[PDB]
DNA sequence: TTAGAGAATTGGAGAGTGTGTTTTTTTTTTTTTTT
DNA sequence: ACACACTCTCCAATTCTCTAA
């Protein structure tokens, strides 16, 4: 495909659990103790007390380059935490010509999308006898 | 064996991409005039050579093509054979 | 005077190898037990 | 194992030289 579609979905989207009355476990309320390793994967709902809030920074989805010798841009997708920069110009037609071209980066073209991280906290009048307190990470993105 | 290398030939400049479209156009591109300097004047001549140079061989420094081109200009005989039948043409 | 056949010199493609990385104050705001 | 720095090697691109038409 010429281009990955992510960089031209103008659009984000969200589920919204079932609603208790019509009831599922996305329905019933889960204290911070009760997220067991046995629901990574799974759609939950979470109970507790906001800690802490970041402030809002852009983070990459799709990033842009130019080619200076043969006038032509390459897309790269990210999906980890980190990446390493591309530096050669890969393409079958610079390379049939040899032309050896410089890599640049672009934000004119690059796709960010807005990004901010919480913290959430079990109710103290939750908390057993003898323990303290657990907490839980929050990612949030789009509108 | 490693890839072979890409090289500037004949072929190229006899193809209909090569050096028809320079006599296809070269009396439309260029334009002198006495009402500017000969360092205009100058400089408008090779604008449309350099462009032309580019596109077709994009390699190497403008230079470089002018001198590559010595060669092959003295050396080929189906070159020369083009050439000569230009100025037929004139002598028709 | 052109050109084509053979020899010598050089460039860098690209393949290979070895390597490095995770990890006693001194000054100032606040709670607590001690005289 | 994953980017780097550095070493090694082979092969063909190039220019130079000699010969004859
Ligand atoms: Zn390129």
Not at chain 1, 91 to 117: D, H
Not at chain 2, 10 to 15: I, T
């Amino acid at each position: 495909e010429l281009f990955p579609p992510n960089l031209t979905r103008r659009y984000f989207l969200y589920f919204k659990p079932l609603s208790q009355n019509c009831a599922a476990i996305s329905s019933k309320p889960l204290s911070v103790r009760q997220i067991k390793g046995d629901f990574l994967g799974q759609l939950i709902t979470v109970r507790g007390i906001i800690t802490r809030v970041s402030d809002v920074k852009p983070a990459v989805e799709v990033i842009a380059y130019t080619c200076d010798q043969c006038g032509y841009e390459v897309f790269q997708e990210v999906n980890s935490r980190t990446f390493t920069p591309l530096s050669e110009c890969t393409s079958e037609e610079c390379s049939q010509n040899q032309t050896k071209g410089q890599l640049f980066m672009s934000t004119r073209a690059s796709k960010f999308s807005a990004f901010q991280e919480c913290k959430i906290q079990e109710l103290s009048q939750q908390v057993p006898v003898g323990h303290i307190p657990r907490s839980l990470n929050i990612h949030v993105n789009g509108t | 064996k490693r890839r072979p290398q890409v090289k500037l030939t004949a072929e190229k400049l006899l193809s209909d991409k090569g050096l028809p479209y320079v006599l296809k156009n070269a009396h439309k591109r260029i334009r002198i005039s006495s009402k500017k300097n000969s360092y205009d004047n100058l400089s408008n001549i090779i604008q449309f050579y350099q462009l032309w140079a580019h596109e077709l061989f994009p390699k190497a420094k403008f230079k470089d093509f002018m001198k590559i081109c010595q060669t092959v200009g003295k050396t080929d005989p189906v070159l020369r054979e083009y050439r000569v039948s230009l100025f037929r043409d004139e002598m028709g």
